[PDB]
Nucleic acid binder design. Sequence first.
DNA 1: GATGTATATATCTGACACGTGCCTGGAGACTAGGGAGTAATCCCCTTGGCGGTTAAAACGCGGGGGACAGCGCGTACGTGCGTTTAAGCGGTGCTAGAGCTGTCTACGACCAATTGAGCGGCCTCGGCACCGGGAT
DNA 2: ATCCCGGTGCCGAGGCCGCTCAATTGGTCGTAGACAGCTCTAGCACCGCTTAAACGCACGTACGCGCTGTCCCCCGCGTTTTAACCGCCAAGGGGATTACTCCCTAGTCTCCAGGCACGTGTCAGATATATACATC
Lengths: 166, 87, 80, 92, 93, 91, 89, 109, 107
Amino acid sequence: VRRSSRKSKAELQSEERKRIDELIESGKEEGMKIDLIDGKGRGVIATKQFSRGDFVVEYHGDLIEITDAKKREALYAQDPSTGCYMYYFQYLSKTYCVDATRETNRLGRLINHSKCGNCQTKLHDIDGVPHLILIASRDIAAGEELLYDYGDRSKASIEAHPWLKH
Amino acid sequence: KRHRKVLRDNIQGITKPAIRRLARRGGVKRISGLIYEETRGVLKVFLENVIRDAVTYTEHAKRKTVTAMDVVYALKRQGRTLYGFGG
Amino acid sequence: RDNIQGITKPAIRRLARRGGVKRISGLIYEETRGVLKVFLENVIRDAVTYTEHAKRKTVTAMDVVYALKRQGRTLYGFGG
Amino acid sequence: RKESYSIYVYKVLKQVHPDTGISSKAMGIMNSFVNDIFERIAGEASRLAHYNKRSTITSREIQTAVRLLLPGELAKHAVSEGTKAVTKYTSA
Amino acid sequence: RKESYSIYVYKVLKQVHPDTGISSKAMGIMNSFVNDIFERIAGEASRLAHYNKRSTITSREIQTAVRLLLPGELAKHAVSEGTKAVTKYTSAK
Amino acid sequence: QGWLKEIRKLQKSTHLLIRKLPFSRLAREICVKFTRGVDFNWQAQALLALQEAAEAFLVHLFEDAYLLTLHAGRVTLFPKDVQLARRIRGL
Amino acid sequence: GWLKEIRKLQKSTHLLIRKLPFSRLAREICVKFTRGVDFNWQAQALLALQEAAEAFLVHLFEDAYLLTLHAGRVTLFPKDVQLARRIRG
Amino acid sequence: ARAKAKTRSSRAGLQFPVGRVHRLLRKGNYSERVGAGAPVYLAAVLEYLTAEILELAGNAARDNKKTRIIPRHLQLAIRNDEELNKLLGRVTIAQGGVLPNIQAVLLPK
Amino acid sequence: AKAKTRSSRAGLQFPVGRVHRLLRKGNYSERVGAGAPVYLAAVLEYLTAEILELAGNAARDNKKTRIIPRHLQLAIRNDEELNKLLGRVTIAQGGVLPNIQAVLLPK
DNA sequence: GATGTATATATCTGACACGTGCCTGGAGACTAGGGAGTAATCCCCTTGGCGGTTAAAACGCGGGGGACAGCGCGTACGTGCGTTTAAGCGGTGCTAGAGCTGTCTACGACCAATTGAGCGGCCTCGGCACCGGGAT
DNA sequence: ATCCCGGTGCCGAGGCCGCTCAATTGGTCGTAGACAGCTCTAGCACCGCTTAAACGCACGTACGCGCTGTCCCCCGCGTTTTAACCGCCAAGGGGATTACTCCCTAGTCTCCAGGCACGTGTCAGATATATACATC
């Protein structure tokens, strides 16, 4: 009757993966409101007791190859009122690009750039296709704004955006 | 001026020529191309073990600085006794 | 003399077969007798040291179990 | 007066599989396993107490030794069991 | 105030190689080596004491701990040196 | 088959694969090389502990040196494989 | 070209992975065994951890290359580092 | 000695002996002193580990459709478990046999 | 009266006193014999004399006068007994023994 | 169609699970002291940031070195079988030697006194590193 | 390319002086363990008999190994680019130390109960044969 419930590491990783997958494919977006920030533009405040590694959002968009990735950012940058919505990542000797300029009911594209923020982006591959996740790498309380790192150090970009270094 | 968005991994900081120099010191005349991700995985596993035990030796001493003796005792526990850091 | 040849060829072959080996080069037999003799030399040196220190003359089971535990090969089933 | 854990392993067995016995050789093996894990945990707690210049082995030292010696889930569940037992013991 | 075997390793160095120094890093390595070999020999001697239900670490226990931990010729020569030193220590009073 | 039935049969039993008396004589011949020419009695369970250890060791040694000779393309265990499986472990 | 590097490295003794990327790696692994609270790694402990990791990786490549000279190869594949570990422990 | 005594194992809810574990911690020279919660913690851990192993050993013994746990079943439980095998890696279990594993490259085609 | 250290009674250079104190306060046994610290100190001095002799040799082979970690790693890994003793031990800043498999040299 | 292997029945046998006397150790209550928990202080030394520099990494490209698949030879391992042999088991014997015990004697813990070795700060100098040149 | 040789240089090591703490000495006691003695267990030896296992031989064929080819993928090279790093500085957290007190554990003694050896009923599983089926 006294039975151990030890949850072997294989089962732990499997249930964690299924948890990420179901939370992604459900898109609850529990407790994040978009408001105004004093100068930076918009802001998505998180209202949950976030901690190490807990799920926050998904940077949903359109996934493409590298040959068009290195081009679409420059081609959409010709519109000076496009903000910043497309995300690159190198994976399996291949770069992709998260085409997310078109507004969708997800809250990934709604985040701005910082180096002193509160979240950092990871990679999750739901059946091959890598969805770009964002989890809280540290303890965040209810009422803080979503803020993660874009990781790009284009020299012209850092000249143009002194708030990138912030 | 729109900027793109990328990331880093802090394990890709164990660069490719660093694994080449480690191999060469180990005597490896000619290295495959897939040994790099395998070696970063091996390194992350080793560090996970040694750092779990260093952080335990610290958290037990009610400290917050992972001293050199914490790491030396973590290695001594794993059986990797390390000479030269105040043992 | 030649008591290592008492570790017969089919005994080494049955040990291998248990270990999973499918075919066995006829030279593995002398190699395995050498390996076994080295293992026994170590374990029996430590067992007989544990005895000689205990001022005894019969190598007990705990002497050998402590010899194995010292080499790092803890053996369950004979005390401890 | 030979010391063993035979009757307590019998108790734990009859608590887990109430309709299962255990041979004498397996009894000796479980005895050796308990002795060995005890020796490990006690030696590690001793090392911790010596490292931190303490004199007493306490539940803190035993918990840290358990966390060092047992791998992940075993350590988590063993720490749970021991903490529960210590709280119950100091309550009663 | 921290103790270490620096001055003694240095005396032994001036014994075996009079015209030779030892860098501070190799000094730390010899300190750690002496500490580790001491811990091995004394731990094995403690274990040899408790295995025989006795309480005193005597020269007997240390000789057997050496004969256990050190390989063949190291063991024989270290035991020779230890016995020499013990007889010299009990002879002179 | 033939080797496959012997393998499935031996990996599933728990016997002592070396005869008890030849291993007894071997351990008593090595127990004399140390403590030159003084016959220590051997507690009949010390020989069992020693044989259990030597057999678990040799079986693991062949199980580790057969990963080196499926790795080397062979199927036949060679002395090279055993020497390398020992030279990797640290022996 | 490779031999003027093996001889050059087996003869030196300095560290091989850079100090700052390894420090960031060790601090990224230490932040998941404390559940997100970070510890001030004493700068002499990063060196001990790095010396242990380099000596370990170098011994691992010595054994792996004992295995890749066994299979007739000269190249060091990942199926080797993966077996010099499944043998070693 | 009034107020009839209940064993410390009973007070803590364990099956292993808190008393005997305390006595072993004392006359073993692990430290001059020994906490009051140290035997209880260590005995709870020992009981947990032994339950973890006897559970898997009984599972193996009933998979083999037997009702006596034997050394072979203990070796099965331990080596087949992922973490007990790491805790007991250096450990030979007398008359424990080896795990049935013929490398898949050996089978006939 | 006038005293002389036990390290001098035994003719050692290592401290019989510090070794005795370490055996006591280390909780190795409820007691410690009188010959135990002398024996342990003699063994420690012998091992260190061995190591430092081989390290001085490896330093003179490099035409240097300081013993550095690399020289200790050479002195250890080249001697068979010590390498068997200090087998699990990594010696920081110690490098590796130059050993390129003879299969690799150009024919 | 052997040849072995999965499934049931009969059984019986040594091993296991259980009831009992007792005795040795586990629990309770109490006292004392010293170990350590807590608070406060000081300053070490860790973290963070910036500029610049440059060493090193990244990337791309050619090529040729090596991995891998295929193949043929021949040798050496597995299998099968009749023979030889040595392990194994059961007896008895017996006796050395392990385990236990009581005596007592030597030896180690403890404690006061002391004094000198060693540890830390100061200071000098040379070993080994570096920058440049000639020879192999 | 790389070693042998000059000359600078620098920084770390080797020696010197003042304090302090811990190593030495001496005396006492109590207890551990050395020793002599005794019991009785179990280890060694032997020997007859069984017979299971080893062994030696022969044969074939599975496999190791050497050779060849081709295809691709590491390596070396050159150029750009990037981020490690070193110095410098500033801050401030938290490590290390210390003093106080209190509470937690060792020691002691008395009580008593649980667990251990011992004897015993019984049954789980290992054979043995028969029945049915899997397999090369």
